[PDB]
Design a protein around this ligand. Structure first.
Ligand SMILES: CCCCCCCC/C=C/CCCCCCCC(=O)OC[C@H](COP(=O)(O)OCCN)OC(=O)CCCCCCCCCCCCCCC
Ligand SMILES: CCCCCCCC/C=C\CCCCCCCC(=O)OC[C@H](COP(=O)(O)OCCN)OC(=O)CCCCCCCCCCCCCCC
Ligand SMILES: Nc1ncnc2c1ncn2[C@@H]1O[C@H](COP(=O)(O)OP(=O)(O)O)[C@@H](O)[C@H]1O
Ligand SMILES: [K+]
Ligand SMILES: [K+]
Ligand SMILES: [Mg+2]
Ligand SMILES: [Mg+2]
Lengths: 681, 557, 29, 188
């Protein structure tokens, strides 16, 4: 993934010519109406040339065999571009199937670590099966970590060897098969049965067996068919038109004229632009469900981003224990430890760890206290332990203050100042309360991903508004929004509020791009038109979202916009190029076609072509060669530039609009000159 | 000569724009379902009497109302021509028309084509001209304007399943716009010398002693609606070249203005309804640029005229053959472009006698689908088809979803737009080909060589595009030509209306999206050039082979 | 009529019908 | 939905076919009776023609108009139309050469360069108008036949010459029928 091979590898070019030959079958050509006409015309000219050779029909057999041969080259060149794009696509798919499956799964009889493990091959693992793994092994199947925490190497899938952190109880519980556990151990509960693995999602992404045409391709095909219909009528009716003014134009010339007129350049390359664009997504470490969602990224005007997990690296670690007035640091840690004994969230574990070195307290366990724990919830924004009589709770400032006011008491003035102080630099303030008495605040440091500021500047230039939606405190969100470069933010946002914001933006008709990492983003990821899920997040977010980013880049929408706009631009530019190519075809064939029926029409031979037969041949040869010459353009796409709509259209109309008017004039003239020099004409 | 031609074009366009702007405001009120001042009281009583409750109808019901009214008018006109001898106002006992001539004439006037394979002064009675032809001149024109009303409403309406009431639109267009404007034009025509009477034919004892029989009839009333509604059906065979129809150059100038009046006002009304006048001006800019160039080429071609005239012994080579002295070569050239860029079809000069290049441009103007100001209503939605192609290509080239006036363009719109665009060129090429493979079609030619093929190509192109003008040398009064052109006129008219109505039905249900920073503007020189390029390139590439064997071969010989 | 004209008319008609069918059902094509 | 369709078509048919033309005829005959009735020229009780319809003049003392390509006879109002002859048609060259030779023989005192309008048929076949320069080309033939001078013929041509409001919407023309009719009164 992300390691490019070549544009013309010798191993795949020879395999593409073999697949192009087997694509000459009428069943394969039936699904492409533009190329089917060329296929039919090639057979008609071949049969006509056979009749002239046998003497059954008067005419020049060599000329008909020369037109028919290049007509077969045109359909072979179109099938070669499609095979090259598909062959390069299946090469990436074959690269991913190559991931090694350990088949060494230590299934556990019971979930708790330390049980006896029985040798079971990986393929027998199904949903709900607990598998124990040790350092240095390979994860057998995708699942959610149920216990333990260790480093995981995901270079097999993401292509980068930087270790990641996987642990239970948080947003790092999701794990994927084929990765290598690094440090201690994990206890993974398989969540997907075989056949629905994340790797299968990546394969079906580039396998392209039965590719589904996007609505843009379908709409373009309608126009291409309509142009073919009008050119077929304008060529078929030419025979009775010329038959009255003299000898009728030969069928071979009419077939050659029709192929040169119908949009063979875009028609033969249309099936290669879609596959190449999907292959460029894999090179960008983006796994898209379908090409339709990719093309929707060219119209998005606002981008919604999560803070923790997406913009920041997550794994919030407590830094200092700031105590309230009248409370010492020793007392603060004791309450903090109690509320985080069973807290498996990354913040909860950091609370317990930080307290040990500060004060070496005896390691209490949950069963020793005979108490229950309140798990952290996005809606509640608080957690703690309801031990006998005494109550310990911690959570967000707003959640704790509301709970304190309902129970009774008032927030100390120093505490409110401390909350603002610790939220100014960017640390999220956690307020811990003991019953109705506030004990202090805890500062959770977070790390903002590097380079996000300049990437966000590129999004601003692209006309995309970046909004940071988070449920954290308003004061700390502003210090993180200004440390990332986003336009606007929305703090203290419940998971039901992010969904409302996407619907509110979609109400006006705009397209919303949403990126998220946590499980609470899954409802808001299925609503946005363009949804990108980090590979380091949960499995629920990965399936709810349209695309998955393997590099966990919050600003990965830039690459999605590139390819999404590139596919549309390549289709439009090539369509304009093909239609504009017909002007020189008329100046080369019409004077040649009626050289004997109307000698006065030779005044339109502005290119001064040598012979009427050489004039028609040069147009047919150029028609075939232009497809092969534009193969790298279709595979790479039209270059994208961050310009305005009126400036991008102007530049594209100058390169492919005016360029399409002038290129065939030079190309046909050069081919005609070469034929004259070689003595063929 | 060039200065005189430039002044004529500038004066015609300046006066047309001045008159069309107030009419656009009035047409915008009809589109917005706002009654014109002073008509609210009359409309309430009239609508109740006629059983029209202004009930909103969808595109299927709106299309059926237009189709039903046209079919009813077709049957009435067809039987009126057949039983003309049994009808009053027949001072000359002209018999009923033949089945093929009546069918062709009935279809021609219903489809707003007004192709005529007869001579009115010796074929039709006053009743047939007044109650049969003039009635369809009003009704066919109102049908086209009603359809473009629905399409304009589709763009300006949000999440709606209805496009107004067709019966209300037809009554409002005919009674408040077509009838009063035609009456003023007709009265001006009478003052200048046009005929308006019901007297029998007048015998004339000439100065030299010969006998002349002057035809009569209510010419002026028919002439006004013939010009205003882009009908083009002349009372006499000479059409607008007849002195009794177009007596002076003053009437001729008004006739050209009346051709472009409603089509230009519709563009002005389109911008006002959408709330952005730049959109309406963009359509006029694209239409005017093509129109201005076309007039200059025809004027230049006709000025050179016949090269043999100087050698034969004349003092000038200007092509005065088939032209009126009171108009001149320059005015005849302008009228030919105006009547062929639009779907009017009236002629003040014989297009068959035009030079090879002089007659090629009017023929090509018809072949591109009649989008250079087009007919009444038909030109606007004909240009809308090319606008949809333009935004589809422009949107792809900028990496954005195609859009026009904030409405997304989907697969269904492209499917209908492609079908609508393909209808007319298919009939022109297939119809002309069928004539060339039959003795009956070929024998109708008058001139030999490539110009003979131009007569056949012009006839089919005019009928399929509902223009009505002709290379009059062709003898089309045959059952083969009457039936073939009737099929082309019928399919060429209603075969575009049905997909356009379906386009309005699909677009009206959508909700317009507000323009963002990345939205491509649809106004300005860049989009005007793109729209012009889309129209010209599609139109040229389709008809280059046919034109090469016709006027191009004639010009180069 | 010549036997080559007849076989040239049906071929155009079949191709036009195939393309018209393809345009109507462009989703499958 | 049949009642709205039938009522709208019938009402519009009556308005456009039985009310609009009746109002136009009543107002036209009241305000402009002469033009609405054909602009007929009458002497005594016999109509001598219409001021807008051209006639076929073949005499030597009469100004000659443009050729008329009518069906039966030249300047036939029962069959209005042009020749519809193409530029490339050799039959048009034959007709022009015959007209040039005929005009040259009938006007031996004029310039050999015949005006173009006198050798080309009009678009209607009833053209009553020629340009003043075209009429002046025939002055020496008319002056000798009618025993008149050049000065009187130029004034008579100018008296029956009309020009448009502006110079580019039309051409200056001479009413041939009216000029020839006045030529008979002057000779009387
Ligand atoms: C004929 C073959 C295709 C031929 C292609 C030729 C390409 C020509 C391009 C020229 C641009 C060079 C600019 C050089 C500098 C010009 C300076 C100036 O004054 O430019 C004024 C405006 C700027 O408008 P704006 O204020 O930026 O934009 C705000 C308004 N929307 O450009 C213009 O008018 C330029 C008009 C260009 C018209 C191009 C038409 C292309 C037709 C394509 C047909 C496709 C068919 C598809 C069918 C399915
Ligand atoms: C309202 C309804 C209107 C309907 C009527 C109008 C329709 C008009 C449309 C199409 C008809 C075109 C005429 C028919 C075309 C030619 C027929 C003919 O006669 O061809 C003779 C040759 C040489 O004969 P020879 O040795 O010189 O003696 O025969 C051959 O090659 C043998 C095979 C003949 C034809 C085979 C293919 C025809 C090609 C047509 C062009 C299509 C372009 C390519 C399509 C893939
Ligand atoms: N384990 C936890 N226990 C108590 N409170 C927490 C815990 N984790 C987060 N919070 C607080 O709950 C609030 C809501 O968090 P959330 O909506 O998940 O924001 P984010 O997505 O930025 O983590 C945050 O302001 C945070 O301070
Ligand atoms: K081509
Ligand atoms: K018409
Ligand atoms: Mg969280
Ligand atoms: Mg968040």
């Amino acid at each position: 993934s992300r390691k490019q091979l070549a544009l013309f590898e010798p191993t795949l070019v020879v395999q593409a010519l073999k697949e192009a030959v087997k694509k000459l079958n009428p069943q394969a050509q039936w699904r492409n109406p533009v190329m089917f006409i060329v296929w039919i015309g090639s057979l008609l000219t071949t049969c006509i040339s056979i009749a002239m050779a046998s003497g059954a029909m008067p005419g020049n057999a060599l000329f008909s065999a020369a037109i028919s041969g290049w007509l077969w080259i045109t359909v072979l060149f179109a099938n070669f571009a499609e095979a090259l794009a598909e062959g390069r696509s299946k090469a990436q798919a074959n690269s991913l199937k190559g991931v090694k499956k350990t088949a060494f799964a230590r299934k556990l009889r019971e979930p708790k670590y330390g049980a006896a493990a029985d040798k079971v091959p990986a393929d027998q693992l199904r949903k709900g099966d607990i598998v124990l793994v040790e350092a240095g092994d390979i994860i057998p199947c995708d699942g959610e970590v149920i216990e333990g925490g260790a480093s995981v190497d995901e270079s097999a899938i993401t292509g980068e060897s930087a270790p990641v952190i996987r642990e239970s109880g948080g947003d790092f519980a999701s794990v994927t098969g084929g990765t290598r556990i690094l440090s201690d151990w994990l206890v993974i509960e398989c969540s997907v049965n075989p056949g629905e693995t994340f790797l299968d999602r990546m394969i079906a992404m580039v396998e392209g067996a039965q590719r589904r045409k996007t609505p843009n391709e379908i709409a373009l095909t309608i126009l291409l068919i309509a142009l073919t219909i009008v050119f077929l009528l304008a060529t078929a009716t030419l025979w009775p038109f010329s038959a009255w003014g003299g000898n009728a134009v030969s069928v071979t010339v009419l077939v050659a004229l029709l192929v040169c007129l119908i949009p063979t350049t875009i028609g033969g390359l249309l099936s290669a632009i879609g596959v190449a664009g999907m292959s460029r997504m894999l090179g960008a470490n983006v796994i898209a469900t379908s090409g339709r969602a990719v093309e929707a990224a060219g119209d998005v005007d606002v981008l919604l981003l999560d803070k923790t997990g997406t913009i920041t690296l997550g794994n919030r670690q407590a830094s200092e224990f700031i105590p309230a007035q009248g409370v010492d640091e020793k007392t603060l840690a004791d309450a903090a430890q109690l509320a985080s004994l069973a807290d498996e969230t990354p913040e909860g574990r950091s609370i317990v760890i930080l307290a040990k070195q500060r004060f070496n307290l005896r390691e209490r366990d949950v069963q020793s206290l005979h108490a229950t724990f309140v798990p952290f919830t996005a809606q509640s924004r608080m957690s703690g332990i309801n031990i006998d009589n005494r109550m310990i709770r911690k959570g967000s400032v707003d959640a704790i203050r509301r709970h304190v006011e309902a129970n009774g008491g008032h927030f100390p003035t120093d505490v409110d100042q401390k909350v603002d102080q610790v939220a100014r630099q960017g640390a999220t303030p956690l307020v811990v309360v003991e019953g109705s008495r506030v004990l202090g605040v805890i500062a959770l440091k977070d790390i903002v991903k590097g380079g996000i500021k300049e990437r966000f500047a590129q999004l601003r230039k692209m006309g995309i508004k970046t909004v940071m939606i988070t449920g954290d405190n308003r004061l700390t969100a502003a210090a993180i929004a200004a440390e990332a470069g986003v336009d606007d933010f929305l703090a203290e946002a419940t998971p039901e509020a992010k969904l409302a914001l996407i619907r509110q933006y979609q109400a006006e008709g705009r397209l919303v791009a949403m990126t998220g990492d946590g499980t609470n983003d899954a409802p808001a990821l299925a609503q946005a038109d363009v949804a990108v899920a980090m590979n380091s997040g949960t499995q629920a977010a990965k399936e709810a979202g349209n695309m998955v980013d393997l590099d966990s880049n919050p600003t990965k929408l830039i690459e999605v916009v590139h390819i999404g706009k590139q596919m549309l631009m390549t289709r439009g530019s090539l369509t304009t190029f093909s239609i504009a190519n017909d002007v020189a075809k008329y100046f080369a064939i019409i004077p040649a076609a009626f050289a004997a029926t109307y000698p006065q029409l030779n005044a339109l031979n502005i290119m001064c072509l040598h012979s009427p037969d050489s004039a028609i041949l040069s147009a047919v040869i150029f028609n075939a060669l232009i497809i092969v010459f534009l193969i790298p353009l279709a595979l790479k796409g039209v270059s994208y530039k961050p310009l305005t709509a009126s400036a991008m259209l102007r530049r594209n109309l100058w390169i492919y609009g005016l360029g399409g008017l002038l290129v065939p004039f030079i190309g046909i003239k050069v081919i005609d000159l070469l034929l004259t020099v070689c003595g063929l004409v | 000569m060039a200065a005189q031609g430039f002044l004529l074009i500038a004066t015609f366009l300046l006066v047309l724009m001045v008159l069309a702007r107030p009419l656009g405001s009035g047409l915008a009120r009809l589109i917005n379902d706002i009654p014109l001042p002073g008509t609210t009281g009359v409309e309430r009583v009239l609508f109740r009497a006629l059983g029209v409750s202004d009930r909103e109808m969808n595109w299927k019901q709106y299309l059926c109302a237009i189709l039903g009214l046209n079919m009813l008018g077709l049957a009435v006109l067809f039987f009126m021509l057949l039983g003309q001898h049994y009808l009053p106002l027949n001072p000359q006992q002209l018999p009923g028309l033949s089945w093929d001539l009546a069918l062709n004439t009935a279809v021609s006037f219903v489809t707003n084509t007004n192709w005529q394979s007869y001579s009115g002064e010796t074929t039709l009675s006053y009743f047939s001209q007044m109650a049969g032809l003039t009635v369809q001149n009003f009704l066919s024109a109102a049908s086209g304007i009603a359809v473009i009303f629905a399409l304009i409403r589709a763009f300006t309406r949000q999440s709606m399943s209805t496009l107004g009431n067709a019966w209300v639109d037809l009554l409002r267009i005919t009674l408040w716009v077509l009838v009063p404007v035609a009456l003023l034009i007709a009265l001006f025509f009478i003052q200048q010398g046009a005929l308006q009477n019901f007297l029998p034919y007048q015998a004339v004892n000439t100065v030299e002693g010969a006998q002349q029989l002057l035809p009569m009839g209510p010419v002026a009333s028919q002439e006004a609606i013939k010009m205003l509604g882009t009908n083009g059906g002349g009372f006499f065979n000479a059409n607008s070249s007849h002195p009794f129809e177009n007596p002076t150059a003053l009437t001729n100038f008004v006739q050209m203005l009346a051709i472009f009046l409603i089509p230009t006002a519709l563009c002005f009304a389109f911008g006002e309804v959408m709330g952005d006048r730049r959109q309406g001006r963009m359509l006029l800019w694209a239409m005017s640029v093509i129109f201005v160039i076309c007039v200059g080429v025809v004027m230049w071609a006709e000025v050179q005229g016949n090269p043999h005239l100087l050698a034969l012994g004349t003092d000038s080579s200007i092509n005065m053959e088939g032209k009126e002295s009171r108009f001149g070569v320059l005015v005849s050239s302008l009228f030919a472009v105006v009547t062929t860029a639009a779907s009017c079809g009236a002629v003040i000069a014989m297009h068959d006698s035009f030079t090879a290049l002089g007659g090629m441009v009017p023929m090509w103007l018809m072949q591109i689908g009649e989008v250079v100001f087009g007919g009444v209503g038909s030109g606007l939605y004909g240009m809308m088809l090319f606008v949809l192609l333009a935004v589809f290509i422009a949107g792809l080239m900028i990496g954005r979803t195609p859009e026009y006036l904030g409405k997304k363009i989907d697969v269904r719109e492209m499917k209908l737009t492609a079908l609508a665009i393909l209808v007319t060129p298919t009939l022109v090429l297939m119809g002309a080909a069928l004539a060339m493979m039959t003795d009956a079609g070929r024998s109708a030619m008058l001139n030999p060589g490539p110009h003979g093929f131009s007569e056949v190509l012009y006839a089919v192109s005019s009928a399929a595009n509902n223009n009505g003008s002709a290379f009059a040398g062709l003898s089309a009064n045959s059952p083969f030509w009457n039936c073939l052109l009737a099929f082309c006129m019928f399919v060429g008219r209603f075969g575009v209306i049905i997909p356009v109505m379906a386009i309005a039905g699909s677009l009206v249900s959508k909700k317009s999206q507000a323009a963002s920073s990345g939205t491509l503007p649809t106004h300005g020189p860049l989009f005007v050039g793109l729209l012009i390029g889309t129209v010209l390139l599609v139109g040229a590439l389709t008809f280059i082979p046919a034109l090469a064997l016709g006027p191009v071969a004639e010009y180069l010989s | 009529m010549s036997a080559g004209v007849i076989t040239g008319v049906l071929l155009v008609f079949l191709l036009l019908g195939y393309l018209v069918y393809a345009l109507i059902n462009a989703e499958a094509f | 939905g049949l009642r709205p369709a039938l009522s709208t078509f019938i009402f519009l048919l009556l308005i456009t076919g039985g009310v609009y033309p009746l109002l136009t005829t009543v107002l036209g005959q009241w305000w402009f009776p002469w033009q609405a009735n054909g602009s007929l020229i009458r002497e005594g009780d016999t109509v001598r023609g219409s001021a807008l319809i051209g006639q076929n003049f073949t005499g030597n003392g009469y100004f000659h108009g443009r050729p008329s390509a009518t069906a039966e006879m030249p300047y036939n109002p029962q069959a209005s139309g042009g020749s519809n002859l193409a530029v490339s048609n050799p039959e048009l060259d034959k007709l022009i050469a015959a007209r040039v030779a005929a005009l040259r023989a009938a006007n031996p005192d004029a310039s050999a360069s015949v005006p173009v309008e006198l050798v080309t048929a009009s678009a209607s076949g009833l053209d009553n108008n020629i340009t003043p320069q075209a009429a002046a080309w025939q002055i020496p033939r008319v002056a000798k036949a009618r025993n008149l001078s050049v000065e009187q013929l130029t004034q008579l041509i100018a008296k029956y010459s009309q020009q448009p409001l502006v110079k580019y919407i039309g051409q200056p023309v001479v009413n041939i029928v009216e000029l020839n009719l006045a030529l008979d009164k002057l000779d009387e």
